[PDB]
Amino acid sequence: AYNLLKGKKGLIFGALNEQSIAWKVAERAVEEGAEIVLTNTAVSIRMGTIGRLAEKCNTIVVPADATSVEDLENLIDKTMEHFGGKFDFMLHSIGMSPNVRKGRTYDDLDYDYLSKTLDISAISFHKAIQVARKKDAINDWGSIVALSYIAAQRTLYGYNDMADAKALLESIARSFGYIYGREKHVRINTVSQSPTPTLGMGDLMNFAENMSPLGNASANDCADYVLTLFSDLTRKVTMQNLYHDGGFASMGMSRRAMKTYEKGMRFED
Amino acid sequence: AYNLLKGKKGLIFGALNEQSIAWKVAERAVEEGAEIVLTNTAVSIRMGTIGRLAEKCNTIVVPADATSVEDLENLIDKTMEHFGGKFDFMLHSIGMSPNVRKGRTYDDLDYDYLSKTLDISAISFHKAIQVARKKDAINDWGSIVALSYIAAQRTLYGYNDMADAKALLESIARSFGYIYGREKHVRINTVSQSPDLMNFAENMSPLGNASANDCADYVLTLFSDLTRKVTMQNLYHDGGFASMGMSRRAMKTYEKGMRFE
Amino acid sequence: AYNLLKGKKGLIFGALNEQSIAWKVAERAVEEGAEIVLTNTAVSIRMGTIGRLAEKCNTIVVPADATSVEDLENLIDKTMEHFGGKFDFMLHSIGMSPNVRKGRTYDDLDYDYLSKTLDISAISFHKAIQVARKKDAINDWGSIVALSYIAAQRTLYGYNDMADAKALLESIARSFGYIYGREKHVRINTVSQSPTPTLGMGDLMNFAENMSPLGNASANDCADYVLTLFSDLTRKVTMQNLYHDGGFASMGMSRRAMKTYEKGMRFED
Amino acid sequence: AYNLLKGKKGLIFGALNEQSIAWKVAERAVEEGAEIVLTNTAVSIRMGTIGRLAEKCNTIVVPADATSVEDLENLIDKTMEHFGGKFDFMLHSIGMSPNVRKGRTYDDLDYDYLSKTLDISAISFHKAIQVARKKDAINDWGSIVALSYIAAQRTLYGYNDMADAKALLESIARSFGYIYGREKHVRINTVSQSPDLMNFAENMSPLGNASANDCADYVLTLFSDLTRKVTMQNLYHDGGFASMGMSRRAMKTYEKGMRFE
């Protein structure tokens, strides 16, 4: 409780449940003296899950499909209403693939499903920032963050069209980082996070834990790092893809990972 | 004339005119002993230019919208009929942004325009590979190349949504490289080619900018058996640009600009 | 003044004068509630410059050639004495090239001078960390930072053998990051900083200012960012080369840089 | 046999035995119509193995400690005498760590050992290029390659100070690439080659690990005129390893390891 975000206002997407990273950013950002507004889809809100978080953080849950420019124009107006003007930061934490959910392989994509994957997981970020820019919703030296994963750089079996969506997301962070930065000094970055619970499940989380010298970064560790990016101490950090993974991105082989791999290869013999 | 591609068969997208990289790849690939099939839009073919290349390369041009799975299915069928079965290599050299054409700023995109940008410039690559995979069109140890640009990594003002499309294209090369590679050992790579920006890149690059002729020669290596273990790479072909922070030549021009200010 | 480094102890190398980045990290780290020890060469101290900073921050200036394992073993003992035990963080900010100073070009190196360049600018970092590790000088979840520059990745005319030294420095951060991390969860990173005053002079600082949407990062901006890395909020950030450059690393061409370049190319005609 | 290097002349360091990449580069380079000169340490030559390669390649082996500027001066003189003037390409394939040989952990390095590691594995590359530049030994549009490994970017437990030496080697390629390129248009690149680690890399890489034969073929492309605009690059030649996060094959082996635990 350093009061890092004292007198700072933000919008957080993608708080579903207590386990979700955007949920932890929300409750941890207020803890640091921030006012926030929450958003998710009606089918996400109606369940009644996020409302509980929007009790804790005081503040409101504004319904919006983040792929709908209309829903985003409403979201920004209702967000700016609630704060009584501009805000400082925004957390984008959205992404799913109908290709993954319908069990299509990467060499058997449905291209309507792919358009949805790219729209929900990446273009939504551009849409959210463009609506904000047009309504001048964000103060000078504000901070926009989107969550990403290293499949954007290095292919992960079964992660499918989400890898390509994360690459597109990270590029939008650069492209829009330049425009918003040269104009109003607003910084835009991606945090490339460890695989986190709720093919990003059991065996992969063990591999990444063992490979990473500091182990996997928790959702709480992620929330911790993101606060730094919303603080004035990261003002000159923009257009970056920041690995938050206990060193995973910088590792070829750990002794601990090889010890497991060698057993898989040798144990029987 | 090394006969690098003797006995090899190729499909080439994006040959428009004599200045096109894809055009130079087609004529160099035939010089190196490859058989090829050309493809572009019906409208491109109708303008009469690509027919000149098909005659020189002793082959056919098959009309296809590369964003249309149906057209790509027809194309792969006609290509395999022309060759009498499977082929070895494929060049994707397509890309266009309606947002750029209409002079839209990056913070005033049309999202229907952006959909077209991504589809023509990136998803068209996935579509062509997936149709080829389903028809088993490509021989084991085949080679697929798409052309890209460093805006995929580093922002160029005014390159607009094409930067994001290139980032997506390069990711498709990796995603599909893994899938096509593990089975049939087909390699998939992007060549990040050279492009006032032209003058800046020329002076920044110790060897100067790569020409379309230069790029054609480099792509031949990737279709050759000599690059069989090179896959899922984004290969800078730019006379050193991607590895430069500042050259003497580029700094001298910039300094003169600071003094005229 | 968030009290980020409340009850935290560190060692800072390379404070020469008020303009120097390690000087600003020192005075800014105490401001955030840290105790520090200062070090430089006798010829740096004797001038009497750093002593003034070691008045402001209370604490001592311990003389040490950071290329001498003997001087470093003394430094760590005297540092741990002064704190009455282990410390938490360490700032490495050392580097020069006799090749640069004697005006030799990269294709006319003196190889004794190169050994010195690599030793002062990179191997010194390994030496400092190895001495610390052998004396268990650093608490669990401690943070080691070395300052670097993008010439490590992208060649800069006239920057000479320093580019190769920065590449070697950044690699040591990874190599030692893994060892110190898997054992005692100590994180190790490099901050790749903007060109900063005291070929990293006038025309280059203008180019980097114009190219970077947020302009060059100051020594004060750098000190700000480094505090985040010493804080508990970056615990899972290790083996990273972190660009702090107003977006330089992520830029191909800004409108503002091209406006200057086009004048250089066209103005006369 | 493409005659890729017809009329070209090369100097090759690091050929020890039939299994060496440098050995395979020498014999493939001659097959492709190059003339070469071989170099290794006096002690290496005395063991009798490399003389077999010099006979096959119809050439000489010149003794040189590649860390000795004096020996490199003698080598470049003898090479240029053998060829009757300038040559086109050079392969650096040297590297050894006394710290690794003596089983020193990375947090217990000997700094005299580390000096030797850096000198043999990295600075030797600068030394050879600088001596070649001063004697103007290399033709315009020549090609210099050194062999590297991805430990330069991503940490492998037990690869030790060799990881840092590879990071330094790759930086020298860029630093010297710019200087040699701007004048004489000589390209300088590193090839980041494949290497239980061998099994892990084989299963992670969609195409499997690159062999020394594979690497020789790829290096031929970099000595050929077809790669003239490729410089200051670190080129992964690894069947896709550098672009992989996790493969099905690698994950299956790892899963079996988790269950045996």
The residues on D that touch B, with CB distances below 8 Å, are 2-4, 174, 177-178, 181-182, 185, 187, 194, 206-207, 210-211, 214-215, 217-218, 220-221, 224-233, 235-240, 242-244, 247-249
Measured in angstroms, the CA of C113 and the nearest CA of chain A are apart by 31
Give chain A positions within 8 Å (CB) of B69.
111
Interchain contact, D218 vs B232, CB within 8 Å: no
Identify the closest residue of chain A to C140 by CA–CA distance.
A214
Three-state SS across chain A? CCCCCCCEEEEEECCCCCCCHHHHHHHHHHHCCEEEEEEECHHHHHCCHHHHHHHHCCCCEEECCCCCHHHHHHHHHHHHHHHCCCEEEEEECCCCCHHHHCCCCHHHCCHHHHHHHHHHHHHHHHHHHHHHHHCCCEEEEEEEEEEECHHHCCEECCCCHHHHHHHHHHHHHHHHHHHHHHHHCCEEEEEEECCCCCCCCHHHHHHHHHHCCCCCCCHHHHHHHHHHHHCHHHCCCCCCEEEECCCHHHEEECHHHHHHHHHHHHCCC
Q: Would you tell me the crossing angle of helices C69-83 and C124-134 to the nearest 10 degrees? A: 50
Could you give the CA distance from residue A75 to residue A238 in angstroms, rounded to a whole number?
A: 25
Interchain contact, B155 vs C252, CB within 8 Å: yes
Q: Would you tell me the crossing angle of helices B248-260 and B197-204 to the nearest 10 degrees? A: 130
The resolution of the experimental structure, rounded to one decimal in Å, is: 1.7
Measured in angstroms, the CA of C138 and the nearest CA of chain A are apart by 16
Please enumerate in sequence order all residues whose Cβ is within 8 A of that of C14, keeping only pairs 6 or more positions apart, or say none: C20, C21, C22, C40, C91, C92, C93, C94, C147
- Option in A203, A258, A267 nearest D251 (CB): A203
Distances (CA, A) of A205 to A37, A216, D64, D244, D246: 31, 8, 50, 16, 12
Measured in angstroms, the CA of A224 and the nearest CA of chain C are apart by 5
Q: Does D3 reside within a domain?
A: no
Report the number of distinct structural domains present in chain A. 1
Identify the closest residue of chain B to A107 by CA–CA distance.
B130
Measured in angstroms, the CA of A40 and the nearest CA of chain C are apart by 27
Give chain A positions within 8 Å (CB) of B133.
107
Backbone angles phi, psi at A15, to 5 degrees: -75, 105
Place of tokens 């003037």: D85
Q: What is the CATH number of the domain that holds B53?
A: 3.40.50.720
Q: Does D2 reside within a domain?
A: no
Give chain B positions within 8 Å (CB) of D232.
206, 240, 242-244
Q: Does B175 reside within a domain?
A: yes
Q: Does D153 reside within a domain?
A: yes
Interchain contact, A250 vs D197, CB within 8 Å: no
Measured in angstroms, the CA of D56 and the nearest CA of chain C are apart by 35
Are A17 and A49 contacting, i.e. CB atoms less than 8 angstroms apart? yes
Chains with 3 or more CB pairs under 8 A to chain A: B, C, D
Distances (CA, A) of A36 to A39, A87, D77: 10, 9, 73
- Option in C114, C133, C176 nearest D123 (CB): C114
DSSP lists the bridge partners of residue B35 as B9
Identify the closest residue of chain C to A183 by CA–CA distance.
C213
Interchain contact, C177 vs A250, CB within 8 Å: yes
Give chain D positions within 8 Å (CB) of B218.
226-227, 229-230
Interchain contact, A107 vs B133, CB within 8 Å: yes
Q: Does B226 reside within a domain?
A: yes
Interchain contact, B258 vs C260, CB within 8 Å: yes
Q: Does A75 reside within a domain?
A: yes
Are A83 and A9 contacting, i.e. CB atoms less than 8 angstroms apart? yes
Q: Which domain holds residue C235?
A: 8-267
Q: Does C61 reside within a domain?
A: yes
What is the identity of the amino acid at B17?
Answer: N
- Option in A214, A235, A242 nearest C238 (CB): A214
Ranges assigned E (strand) in chain C: 8-13, 34-40, 61-63, 87-92, 138-148, 155-156, 187-193, 241-244, 251-253
Interchain contact, C179 vs D118, CB within 8 Å: no
The residues on A that touch B, with CB distances below 8 Å, are 69, 105-109, 111, 114-115, 118, 123, 126-127, 129-130, 133-134, 152, 154-155, 157, 160-161, 163-164, 166-168, 170-172, 174-180, 239
Could you give the CA distance from residue A157 to residue A242 in angstroms, rounded to a whole number?
A: 23
Q: Does B45 reside within a domain?
A: yes
Are C174 and C231 contacting, i.e. CB atoms less than 8 angstroms apart? no
Identify the closest residue of chain A to C244 by CA–CA distance.
A237
Break chain B down into helix, strand, coil percent, rounded to 5: 50, 20, 30
Cβ neighbour number for residue A101 with a 10 Å cutoff: 11
Measured in angstroms, the CA of D134 and the nearest CA of chain C are apart by 8
Identify the closest residue of chain C to B242 by CA–CA distance.
C154
Could you give the CA distance from residue A112 to residue A101 in angstroms, rounded to a whole number?
A: 14
Measured in angstroms, the CA of B2 and the nearest CA of chain A are apart by 35
